Design an enzyme around this catalytic site. Structure first.
Site, mmCIF file in Angstrom:
data_model
loop_
_atom_site.group_PDB
_atom_site.id
_atom_site.type_symbol
_atom_site.label_atom_id
_atom_site.label_comp_id
_atom_site.label_asym_id
_atom_site.label_seq_id
_atom_site.Cartn_x
_atom_site.Cartn_y
_atom_site.Cartn_z
ATOM 1 N N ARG A 153 2.826 -10.580 -2.269
ATOM 2 C CA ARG A 153 3.165 -10.503 -3.701
ATOM 3 C C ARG A 153 4.561 -11.049 -3.967
ATOM 4 O O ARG A 153 5.533 -10.437 -3.569
ATOM 5 C CB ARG A 153 3.062 -9.053 -4.159
ATOM 6 C CG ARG A 153 3.111 -8.835 -5.630
ATOM 7 C CD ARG A 153 3.009 -7.362 -5.883
ATOM 8 N NE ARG A 153 3.279 -7.018 -7.258
ATOM 9 C CZ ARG A 153 4.139 -6.090 -7.656
ATOM 10 N NH1 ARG A 153 4.849 -5.380 -6.779
ATOM 11 N NH2 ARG A 153 4.286 -5.876 -8.952
ATOM 12 N N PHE A 174 12.045 -11.751 -9.857
ATOM 13 C CA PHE A 174 11.884 -10.296 -9.752
ATOM 14 C C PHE A 174 12.037 -9.884 -8.278
ATOM 15 O O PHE A 174 13.092 -9.363 -7.898
ATOM 16 C CB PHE A 174 10.538 -9.882 -10.378
ATOM 17 C CG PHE A 174 10.183 -8.418 -10.240
ATOM 18 C CD1 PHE A 174 11.148 -7.434 -10.013
ATOM 19 C CD2 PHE A 174 8.856 -8.018 -10.393
ATOM 20 C CE1 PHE A 174 10.797 -6.091 -9.916
ATOM 21 C CE2 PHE A 174 8.500 -6.669 -10.283
ATOM 22 C CZ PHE A 174 9.495 -5.701 -10.050
ATOM 23 N N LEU A 194 14.291 0.180 -11.351
ATOM 24 C CA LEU A 194 13.741 0.751 -10.132
ATOM 25 C C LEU A 194 14.668 1.805 -9.469
ATOM 26 O O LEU A 194 14.260 2.457 -8.533
ATOM 27 C CB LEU A 194 13.432 -0.360 -9.127
ATOM 28 C CG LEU A 194 12.428 -1.442 -9.558
ATOM 29 C CD1 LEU A 194 12.122 -2.349 -8.343
ATOM 30 C CD2 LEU A 194 11.154 -0.867 -10.140
ATOM 31 N N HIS A 237 12.674 3.710 -6.052
ATOM 32 C CA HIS A 237 12.500 3.088 -4.737
ATOM 33 C C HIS A 237 13.774 3.253 -3.920
ATOM 34 O O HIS A 237 14.881 3.074 -4.441
ATOM 35 C CB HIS A 237 12.164 1.604 -4.922
ATOM 36 C CG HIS A 237 10.917 1.400 -5.703
ATOM 37 N ND1 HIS A 237 9.697 1.165 -5.103
ATOM 38 C CD2 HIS A 237 10.675 1.526 -7.032
ATOM 39 C CE1 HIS A 237 8.765 1.090 -6.042
ATOM 40 N NE2 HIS A 237 9.332 1.308 -7.219
ATOM 41 N N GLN A 254 7.621 -9.096 -1.924
ATOM 42 C CA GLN A 254 7.092 -7.894 -1.320
ATOM 43 C C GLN A 254 6.208 -8.259 -0.125
ATOM 44 O O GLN A 254 5.358 -9.160 -0.216
ATOM 45 C CB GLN A 254 6.225 -7.119 -2.334
ATOM 46 C CG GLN A 254 5.653 -5.800 -1.804
ATOM 47 C CD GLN A 254 4.928 -4.997 -2.864
ATOM 48 O OE1 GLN A 254 5.168 -5.180 -4.062
ATOM 49 N NE2 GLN A 254 4.028 -4.101 -2.435
ATOM 50 N N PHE A 276 10.415 -4.640 -0.343
ATOM 51 C CA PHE A 276 10.603 -5.830 -1.157
ATOM 52 C C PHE A 276 12.066 -6.270 -1.157
ATOM 53 O O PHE A 276 12.978 -5.478 -0.867
ATOM 54 C CB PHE A 276 10.057 -5.611 -2.572
ATOM 55 C CG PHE A 276 10.762 -4.523 -3.349
ATOM 56 C CD1 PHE A 276 10.410 -3.183 -3.189
ATOM 57 C CD2 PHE A 276 11.767 -4.836 -4.246
ATOM 58 C CE1 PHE A 276 11.058 -2.168 -3.911
ATOM 59 C CE2 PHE A 276 12.412 -3.828 -4.980
ATOM 60 C CZ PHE A 276 12.047 -2.484 -4.802
ATOM 61 N N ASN A 303 6.475 1.466 -2.855
ATOM 62 C CA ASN A 303 5.731 2.712 -2.796
ATOM 63 C C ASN A 303 4.639 2.727 -3.814
ATOM 64 O O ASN A 303 4.531 1.816 -4.654
ATOM 65 C CB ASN A 303 6.656 3.947 -2.943
ATOM 66 C CG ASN A 303 7.321 4.038 -4.303
ATOM 67 O OD1 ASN A 303 6.661 3.864 -5.349
ATOM 68 N ND2 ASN A 303 8.638 4.337 -4.315
#
EC number: 5.2.1.8
Lengths: 164, 136
Positions: free
Chosen positions: A54, A59, A121, A125, A62, A112, A101
């Site tokens: 991903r 951004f 975030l 995370h 991951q 990531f 997660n």
């Protein structure tokens, strides 16, 4: 000294280059240790051969699901999931290494790499490291991502381990 | 239901009880169920189901239908790990939709999110599929 890990990244089997990470063992020792050990393969499994499944340009990137090239899988060295150690460190900018997660206390192997500040975030995370070298290699990975995250080529951890 | 959340009306509950006692699980129960549960949360739907006194074999069959639809949801909506983009929330699992593993607060969070994930309407559809098998 905080440990250092490298990934050697490949695109459809062709080397792209090396990324290295400092792991903040001084502040998140359990989380740092999981990533360090999955990097070396010393528990008998880990990140070598696994994909970035991903990638969203601007951004994050991951990966770390060493079972499938998708967002469902992986385990920590402690068991299937472990707790959120702490949220001391923030998603301050590009290079931040943080745990993926599926909600609270569901950390496994997936992580990531931020390619921007992701303040939303923070406290969700666990941040446990940061890119030292090869932020250019992370940026080069983005070319193969999309707004939805799907990769158009197979981006793999061809090799990995500990430098210090 | 959510209209704001409100506790399920006790006389709407009692109307539903009356409908089952008189029509058992003949075809006429499905429209009544549908009419009586509008805006329902999964919690509310479970209250409705858990108020059915007896009809053990009918309820077992329903529970089995729900589990099949929940498993199908999970197979097509695997629980992929985040992180999520801003303002977005996590998708429900099949057991979250059925009210087994989601709290009322979590259901309201989905149902009132923008865009909404209408866990109440999704689960109500599973229930109606189950009722259609029972009436047979």
């Amino acid at each position: 000294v905080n440990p250092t890990v490298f990934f050697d990244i490949a695109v459809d089997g062709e080397p792209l280059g090396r990324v290295s990470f400092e792991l903040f063992a001084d502040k998140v020792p359990k989380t740092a240790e999981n990533f360090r050990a999955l990097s070396t393969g010393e528990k008998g499994f880990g990140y070598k051969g696994s994909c970035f499944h991903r990638i969203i340009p601007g951004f994050m990137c991951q990966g770390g699901n060493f079972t499938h090239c998708n967002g469902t899988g992986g385990k920590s060295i402690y068991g299937e999931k472990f707790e959120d150690e702490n949220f001391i460190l923030k998603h301050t900018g590009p290079g931040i290494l943080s745990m993926a997660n599926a909600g609270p206390n569901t950390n496994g192997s997936q992580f990531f790499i931020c390619t921007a500040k992701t303040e939303w975030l923070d406290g969700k995370h666990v941040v446990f490291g940061k890119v030292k070298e090869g932020m250019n290699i992370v940026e080069a990975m983005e070319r193969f991502g999309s707004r939805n995250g799907k990769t158009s080529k197979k981006i793999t951890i061809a090799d990995c381990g500990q430098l210090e | 239901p959510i209209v704001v959340h409100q506790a399920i009306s006790p006389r709407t509950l009692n109307a539903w009880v009356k409908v089952v006692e008189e029509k058992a699980f003949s075809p006429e129960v499905i429209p009544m169920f549908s009419a009586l549960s509008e805006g329902a949360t999964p919690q509310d739907l479970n209250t409705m189901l858990n108020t059915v006194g007896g009809h053990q074999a009918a309820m077992q069959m329903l529970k089995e239908t729900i589990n099949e639809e929940a498993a199908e949801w999970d197979r097509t909506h695997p629980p992929a790990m985040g992180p999520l983009p801003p303002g977005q929330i996590r998708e429900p699992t099949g057991s979250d939709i059925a009210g087994t593993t989601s709290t009322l607060q979590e259901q309201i969070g989905w149902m009132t999110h923008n865009p909404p994930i209408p866990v109440g309407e999704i689960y109500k559809r599973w229930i109606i599929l189950g009722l259609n098998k029972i009436v047979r």
